[PDB]
Structures are given as C-alpha cells and as structure tokens.
C-alpha cells in the first residue's frame, strides 16, 4: 500500500513522489478539485488529517525489520502481475524500486 514500504535512498522516494503526482492528476483530472479527496469537513479535522499520516509515516520504518523486508518483495506482487503487463521497463522499475512502485495506486478509488 501507500506509506508502508520505506524507500532506501533519496532516489527511490523521489520517483515514489512523482508517481503519486499522477495519482493526484487522476483524482484531480482538471481545474476542479474533486469531492473525493476532501478528507475533512470541519476546522478540527483539517489539520488532524495532516498529523494523522505523519505518525503513520513513522510507523512504516518503526515496526519491524522483516515485514518491511517482506514489503519490498510484496510490492512487485501487485505491480508486475496486474498493473504493467507487457512493459519490461515498467517491470524492472518495480524490481529496482519497490517502494516507488508501491504508491502507484492503480486501484482507481479517486483518492
């Protein structure tokens, strides 16, 4: 999933960041912001949604050493087999960068 597989270097997190930008571009297809990344209604939950992920971003690199090692083999188990079939370039992008291929989120849930 997102925010659970930790990147190793600056190079992995940057293309992890860049594939998230197209998932912004999917859910924000044009100049209107969608109704579905609204993540809040009141002033209290506006900044609560920001500090919720930053504790969960820490709990990726906090929890273990082998389950997060199993994540980087698991990240090819969603992308290689049912997201980028036929593209070898997009296949070795997973096996060279699993944490970048883990927030690619092609389950179009408009988020």
């Amino acid at each position: 999933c997102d925010r659970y597989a930790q990147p190793a270097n600056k190079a992995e997190e940057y293309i992890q960041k860049s594939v998230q930008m197209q998932m912004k571009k999917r859910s924000i297809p044009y100049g209107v912001y969608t109704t579905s990344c609204a993540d809040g209604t009141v002033k209290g939950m506006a900044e609560n949604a920001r500090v919720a992920k930053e504790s969960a971003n820490f709990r990726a690199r906090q929890m273990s050493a082998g389950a997060k090692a199993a994540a980087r083999f698991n990240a090819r188990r969603v992308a290689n087999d049912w997201h980028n079939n036929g593209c070898n370039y997009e296949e070795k992008l997973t096996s060279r960068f699993p944490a970048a291929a883990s927030s690619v989120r092609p389950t179009t849930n408009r988020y």
Binding site: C1, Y4, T35, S36, A38, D39, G40, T41, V42, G44, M45, N48, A49, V51, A52, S55, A56, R59, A60, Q62, M63
Partner: protein, 56 residues
Amino acid sequence: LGFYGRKADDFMARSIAMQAKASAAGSGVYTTQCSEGASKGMAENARTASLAKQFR
C-alpha cells in the same frame, strides 16, 4: 439488482473485511500498519473522516 440483493451485498463484504481483518490479526495483534488516528485520540474525529468517506 434487487432490494434483497442490495442488503445482501453489504453483509458479506463486511464478512470479507472481517475475514481480512482476521488475516491482519491472524496472530492476535492489531498490527501497526493500520493506523486510523494521530497522537491525540481523534479517531472519533477520524470517524467523521471515514463517515465522510461513507457519505461522499
């Protein structure tokens, strides 16, 4: 696809989620990848995040 089919449909997917909440807690841990809050309690505030997602 039916009123009877519509009220059927949310029950097994609740059971699909409770199947899959029981693979997260295969071993009996609420495992740390699932997070649904902050430091301050605010999961009743993140109830209103998720019930907005229930509503939107």
